[model samples]
Target: AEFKAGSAKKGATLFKTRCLQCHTVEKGGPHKVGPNLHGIFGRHSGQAEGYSYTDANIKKNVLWDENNMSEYLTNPKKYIPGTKMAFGGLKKEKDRNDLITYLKKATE
Candidate 1:
């Protein structure tokens, strides 16, 4: 499927409000707790620069495909025990979908 810039923009707003404190998409954003989310989708988990990942995430060797991302965004703890993400999750399916779409676009 083709990329959706509109949906990605909407997701960007949501990300700024909900996740920008810890994660950054564009360059020069603050990296409070989590790593920069510049190219997340299709990249390996816990593989960003300068961010110290948890042991659980570091031990795993998996790509960030749609299915894996969907599961992880639904519940971080359930997906990876001892992950550093403290936020509960983006429980709403539509929100998760939008965020995933946004991530795909951002990586591209």
Candidate 2:
């Protein structure tokens, strides 16, 4: 079951409103409340250097894939209990798709 991506442009807007406060997408960006998400795809969970992650995150250590990302975005705590992300998951599937699309390019 392939997940179809939505609008990247819309996702950019969503990122600013929903993600920018805690995350960053630029190459070599700083770790905010959350880790910098640069190159998040193909990376392993809890792998960001210098970021303090919960034991739940590191212990899970799941590979970051589009479907995995979508599920996590849909529900953070449910995906990885005690993640400390402080985000109330994005409920809209379209919004998730859009944001993931933006991340795929923005996070590189």
Stretches of candidate 2 exceeding 4 Å from the true structure: none
Model 2: worst 10 consecutive residues (lDDT sum): 1-10
Q: Ten-residue segment with the worst summed lDDT in candidate 1? A: 1-10
TM-score of each: 0.83, 0.95
- Expressed as tens digits, the lDDT of each residue in 8-108 for candidate 1 is 77787778777877887765544678888777777888788778888998877668786677778778888888887768887877777787778777655
Cα RMSD for candidates in order: 3.2, 1.2
What global local distance difference test value does model 2 have?
0.89
Residue-level lDDT of model 2, residues 79-102, one tens digit each, is 898777669898888998999999
- Listed per model in order, the count of residue pairs whose N, CA or C atoms clash below 3 Å is 0, 0
Clashing pairs in 2: none
Best by lDDT: 2
